[PDB]
Amino acid sequence: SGGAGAALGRRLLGAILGGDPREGLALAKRLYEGLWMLGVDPERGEAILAEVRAATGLDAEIDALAAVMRALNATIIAADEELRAADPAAYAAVLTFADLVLTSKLYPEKVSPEEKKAAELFLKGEELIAEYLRGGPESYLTKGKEYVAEAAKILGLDPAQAWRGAVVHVAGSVARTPEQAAALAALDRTFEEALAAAEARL
């Protein structure tokens, strides 16, 4: 039991994947899309969740889960909001990377070989930034920058702007408490697994 987020996820997923497990699988994925976006891009996340709320009728639970997410990702939202306002070019690079990562994970067929490679490279760069911030050797930051710059080059983004955005965004994520990170990981596990079982029915 992962906390409020996972409890609300269990309820919502049971209703969506119950009955039609083909058009329910697509709705469940779209719900995950909205929740994942609340941190990095609140306007985009709320839009998708509004769509899903109109499709399912589970107003109380979707509205409540949005609130839990804003709480769990409060440090990421604040960091990314200041980043957007101070540095729209850097924030545009993180929005691009985030949308690429989410699509690589939910709808891999929508991703080309190069963009998929950029997604892998960026995620390795993000990991090294985060583990620098969590105590790793300074060479983690050097190598992290090499990954981000190469992913930026692939996508035609400017590496200096991509890097600013990546470091600020990761810093906002690393600043979550371990309780918040555990809650988010529990919600994440809830989705990945219910979507596994619904990948056996289809």
Residue numbers in the entry: -1 to 200
Share the article's original sentences.
Here we present rotamer inverted fragment finder–diffusion (Riff-Diff), a hybrid machine learning and atomistic modelling strategy for scaffolding catalytic arrays in de novo proteins. We highlight the general applicability of Riff-Diff by designing enzymes for two mechanistically distinct chemical transformations, the retro-aldol reaction and the Morita–Baylis–Hillman reaction. We show that in both cases, it is possible to generate catalysts that exhibit activities rivalling those optimized by in vitro evolution, along with exquisite stereoselectivity. High-resolution structures of six of the designs revealed near-atomic active site design precision.
To demonstrate the general applicability of Riff-Diff to design enzymes, we selected the Morita–Baylis–Hillman (MBH) reaction as a second model system. The second active site was taken from BH1.8, the MBHase with the highest activity to date. We determined Michaelis–Menten parameters for MBH18 and MBH48, the designs that showed the highest conversion after 8 h for their respective catalytic array. With a kcat of 0.025 min−1, MBH48 activity is 1.5 times higher than in BH32.8 (kcat of 0.0168 min−1), a variant that emerged after screening 13,590 clones in 8 rounds of directed evolution. However, it remains 45-fold less active than BH1.8 23H (kcat of 1.13 min–1), a BH1.8 variant with a regular histidine residue instead of Nδ-methylhistidine. Additionally, by-product formation in MBH48 is minimal. CD experiments confirmed the expected helical fold of MBH48, the most active MBHase design, with an unfolding onset at around 85 °C. The crystal structure of MBH48 agrees with its design model (Cα RMSD 0.78 Å), and the desired catalytic geometry was reproduced with a sidechain RMSD of 1.07 Å. Such precision might explain the high catalytic activity, however, our results show that high activity cannot be inferred from precise reproduction of the apo-state alone.
